[PDB]
Amino acid sequence: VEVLNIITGPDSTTEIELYLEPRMGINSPTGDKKEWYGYSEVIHHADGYDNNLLSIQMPQYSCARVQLPMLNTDTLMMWEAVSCKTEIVGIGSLISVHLLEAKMAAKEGGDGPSQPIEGMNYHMFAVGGEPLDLQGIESNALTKYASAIPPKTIHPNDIAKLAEEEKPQLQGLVPKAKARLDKDGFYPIEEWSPDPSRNENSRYFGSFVGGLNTPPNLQFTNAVTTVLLDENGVGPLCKGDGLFVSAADICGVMVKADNEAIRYRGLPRYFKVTLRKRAVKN
Amino acid sequence: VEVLNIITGPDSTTEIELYLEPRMGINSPTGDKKEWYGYSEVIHHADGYDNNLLSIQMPQYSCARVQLPMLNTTLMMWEAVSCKTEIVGIGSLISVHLLEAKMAAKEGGDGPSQPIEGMNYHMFAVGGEPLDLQGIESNALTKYASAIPPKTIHPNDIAKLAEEEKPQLQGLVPKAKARLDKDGFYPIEEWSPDPSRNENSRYFGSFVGGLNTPPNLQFTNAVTTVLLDENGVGPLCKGDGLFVSAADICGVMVKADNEAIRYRGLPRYFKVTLRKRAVKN
Amino acid sequence: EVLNIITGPDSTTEIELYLEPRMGINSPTGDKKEWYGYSEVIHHADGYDNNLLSIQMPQYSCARVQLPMLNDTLMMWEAVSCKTEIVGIGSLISVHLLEAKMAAKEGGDGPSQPIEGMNYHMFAVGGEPLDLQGIESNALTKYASAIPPKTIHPNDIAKLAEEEKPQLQGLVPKAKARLDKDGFYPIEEWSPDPSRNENSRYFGSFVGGLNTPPNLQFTNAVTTVLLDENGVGPLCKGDGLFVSAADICGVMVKADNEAIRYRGLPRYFKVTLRKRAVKN
Amino acid sequence: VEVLNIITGPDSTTEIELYLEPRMGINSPTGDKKEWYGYSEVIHHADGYDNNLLSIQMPQYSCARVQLPMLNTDLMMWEAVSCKTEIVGIGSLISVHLLEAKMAAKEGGDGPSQPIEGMNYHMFAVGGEPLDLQGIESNALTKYASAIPPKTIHPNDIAKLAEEEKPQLQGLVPKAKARLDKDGFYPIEEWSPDPSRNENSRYFGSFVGGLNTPPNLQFTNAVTTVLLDENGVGPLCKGDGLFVSAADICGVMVKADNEAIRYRGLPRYFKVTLRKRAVK
Amino acid sequence: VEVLNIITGPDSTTEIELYLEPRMGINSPTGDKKEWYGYSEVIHHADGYDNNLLSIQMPQYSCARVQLPMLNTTLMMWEAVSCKTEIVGIGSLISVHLLEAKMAAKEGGDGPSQPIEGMNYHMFAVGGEPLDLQGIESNALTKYASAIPPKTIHPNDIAKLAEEEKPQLQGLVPKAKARLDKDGFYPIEEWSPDPSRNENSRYFGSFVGGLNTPPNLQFTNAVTTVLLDENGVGPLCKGDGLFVSAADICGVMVKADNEAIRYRGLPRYFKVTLRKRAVKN
Ligand SMILES: [Mg+2]
Ligand SMILES: [Mg+2]
Ligand SMILES: [Mg+2]
Ligand SMILES: [Mg+2]
Ligand SMILES: [Mg+2]
Ligand SMILES: [Mg+2]
Ligand SMILES: [Mg+2]
Ligand SMILES: [Mg+2]
Ligand SMILES: [Mg+2]
Ligand SMILES: [Mg+2]
């Protein structure tokens, strides 16, 4: 669409708010594993080699489409996302040093606190007028993944369909390994990144701090607004009067006392997005 | 309501100042545990599983309401424009002779104590009404002690989820909402500022986790925090009250005899500048 | 001589590409294809007890992109700005890395050590190949030779006698090259040359050590401006744009002997160009 | 005071420069302990419990009053506008041959010493009256030695709480207030700048704690600190006195024989620029 | 000199570029120790106590005077306005096969070497005359070796304090002053830029200490450092000389056999832009 003038006058703006709950692999507070909702299943070093890596061991992106007030119901209009407030909620919970099943931080014979949540932090949020474009990669192209119908997750080679001999290409950049973030708890973080070659109609912001013992470093405020306008002053334009929000917030890992295996911990993300009416020509 | 013009002229502005003392769990310098005022009770890895987690083992938010000069006695409200805030007693964190603290030296050494280090949780807020809180749990089935009168409130006190439903609290339970309306009552480990409310508050928060992290803190009187939003409107004080809230966990001390920890908190100063703002009811 | 910016329709263009990492195993083909995007294993005495191999030496990526052919006024493409991203940062959360050391005590079943340690990140956009300056940490390191050569070393150009090679631990002005070949110039021997690169813009950071947490951001909301203090960006000779990159994201540690491999990630570039009038 | 116009003309500005030497506890290069000037006395975990903690084990604030050119000879005050401040001798922190310092190597080794590292407390202040101080105790019942005359003042020297009320000092005791009116006298561990006062002072402070943390310090003559408030008004010098205050704990050394520590401080330079301000 | 107008005209500016090679102590790629050019000699904890500390064990400041085009053949001086500067060879710091370096693995492993890490000291200066230095000692009674002719100069070489007064040098001795007037002669561990002088120089310094700290270094040709003071005046080049100074310790290597260290330095590049300035004498 050709983008024309910002529409002025009353009822020219609106605001939408929502939460994305974390999809760390145990994605429902129902069923056998409900006690660990908001965490991954336990991961051991030879998972994906000695056995098939399960979807419940692979933190995934969160996403939602929000229905906007129907436009075009004079001038053809679309909702334009201009700015958002986003917040990781429950950061205070990460002070706990009495984590159930967690390794004790003390010498043998001590009675110390648990190790708290620490280690790799992966934080991303996106706002767009259509689903977020993803690019696939593998750290280990020959990782063994559990297979189900219906699929619980999608892997880059499910799309790229390289033969065993060509799958090492996935440790680099395989142009065919592309997808849209159209399903919540379905695309693993460890295999999918936002695609900087697309996303012309989305904005995304991410940080990663790696390692297993690194201090989680997180801020929270309602005083900071993220501007979603591009260099021409145009924000994401909401196709079908739909706003698409995407998130991933791995806040670290817990370490299990009995075998020192880990689980990822995620927190919910809040979004408040401000939108204005923009005139367009088809 | 509808905000109109900033009121100008003589006595159109005012300033308030106060201290919030830390509520790390031992919240009074009186009684059995008064020696540990400004610290938590000792915490061990199985507390809340093998026993009931005590209110005194849970660092809590500080809060106060400050009465302003009464207005309307043009409708007018006090509008908080800016504040100076400061953590006081940072230099006390240099101590390497902490009472009962683990020695930082090999066996047979005479080294210093481990100083205060590890997880830092710093938050201040200024608002025209109590700060909105959202409940969470790191572990939904943590066992909590029940004191008389009750010393803390927990998210499930409000959500009233059945034991099979409580794992919802590891995510976002919308019913688990409260207002920061009592000093030393809302635990930091279960309550966060609610970003879905707080339209009339400003909050600023930082967390650095782990047990060994260096506390990293600045102090100055040369920095002003602006409380105005994108429209140039600050918090509007309902009932001619200003609400201030804080949490400042500065780290942990480690006990020599069993390597259990206590949180350490420091007091926070606030100076808030306000101006009269015309409003339409 | 640089004249006015060209105005009007079709006065600008955009080009997009990916540079794949060249950490030493530079092809997903042959005996070592399973470690594409990683280096060969490195041990402390490699380059002393044996010849250091090209596959053990992370290298710069580069490509030349053909622009729309230009040519009233003579015209060059001028690189104004770019968006660049490291892609696949999410893959660095893996704690089940094949052959990696276990992060737990003997008798544990803990996760693998994740990728961590030294990060070397550089990107460059230029109207001609990036100028490089040669150095050696250890001037007498032994390097393997092949024909065709898999890498070029500063002394291949400087041609110092063995007694003079210690000069390469400082600054040897003759040890200069141009980044004209992808997966050829080792990071550990070649730096962007600050005495040239008049027609190139480069940006780099290094955080060293073997245990350091990788610290990486990714966004599409940040533009890097390529204009100099006079408002002139890279001017594209032969209607070619030259992009260069190095992204060492850290190392993996082998369970067997605690030897390491470097890990690199691909880098995306989008470069916005405008027509600049020039004279001669 | 009601503040009026800046006074312009010749002789309307002046510049003050001086050094504050560190007061880490060994506050003089004379006497039995002179070898450790610029360090604290050694500190053990049980000091203040098993024995009385000494003034020489407690880093203290540095301060000076500087007399300015007298005004209202026969209403004007000096206004501090800006300052350049520098920690001098930062290069000395590279030493890995510190006297009596723990060796950084395994038993059997001949490694370097541990260098200065761990908790860094850096503060400077410029004001037109003494810096206001608020008292606190990390441990309210710490036992302090009493010298004659007194070498330090403690918060309860002013608050005078009974031993049963002293745990109040682990929070905020409003009675525990003092002015930084004496060099090498106010312990950093018990006194902080009082943010409820200091309306006529500007202070700047950074702390990074722990025993293992790297010192992180900058030095330049290219940065000016502005002392003006939101109204463009700097500190106004009461009685034509400028007050400068500092604390620069750069880290600790570890003793080889018992692993006890001494704090190490460095001297701080100030250049303050002042102008005449009319006042009612 | 009273400073007047910037001189405009076609031949009113010039640009100089040069390298300063590192003086970590082994200061020439010739002689017995040429193999360790760009490093210090090995350093042990008791050096300067059980023995005389050698000049080759003490990182030193680099410096050069560049001859500018002669002016005054009305009265004029070269004014340094801005520079680009760069640490060259940062990529070399990825090496984990350092000759003679400690293995980063358990006994019986075959791990990589420990790479260059630990203390980073980075300083550059541009002046119209030699940089002013202030002397200090971490340990006033360190024993310095005394070569003929001297290979370094020590603060007490200028302050001439008796042994009983030398502890003054752990603070600030006003007499301990020098000018950075010789390449590889002034140890970093004893000499800092003098902030009480250097009215006609600009210096920029950073230090990160410890033995295990990751080097943290950037490189670009997109960053220009402005040398103009508050008044818009850059350094004025006395006798038509430009004075550049540097120190770039990038970390230490750790020896396998006894875990003694060597410092490692890298070369620094300078491009300085100068303009003609009128002055009055
Ligand atoms: Mg490919
Ligand atoms: Mg595109
Ligand atoms: Mg829910
Ligand atoms: Mg809301
Ligand atoms: Mg040379
Ligand atoms: Mg040049
Ligand atoms: Mg009190
Ligand atoms: Mg006050
Ligand atoms: Mg002196
Ligand atoms: Mg001076």
Residue numbers in the entry:
A (entry chain AAA): 37 to 109, 114 to 322
B (entry chain BBB), E (entry chain DDD): 37 to 109, 115 to 322
C (entry chain EEE): 38 to 108, 114 to 322
D (entry chain CCC): 37 to 110, 116 to 321
Task: Reproduce passages from the article.
Polyomaviruses are small double-stranded DNA (dsDNA) viruses with a circular genome of approximately 5,000 bp.
As the Neu5Ac-binding site residues of NJPyV are highly conserved in ChPyV VP1, we hypothesized that this virus is also able to bind 3′SL. In order to define the ligand binding properties of ChPyV, we solved the unliganded structure of its VP1 pentamer at 1.9 Å resolution. The putative ligand-binding sites are largely blocked in the ChPyV VP1 crystals, preventing soaking with ligands. Cocrystallization with sialylated glycans did not yield well-diffracting crystals. Therefore, we assessed the binding of ChPyV VP1 to 3′SL by STD NMR spectroscopy and introduced a valine-to-phenylalanine mutation (V78F) (equivalent to amino acid residue V78 of NJPyV) in the putative sialic acid-binding site of ChPyV in order to interfere with potential glycan binding. We therefore conclude that ChPyV binds 3′SL in a manner that is identical to that observed for NJPyV.
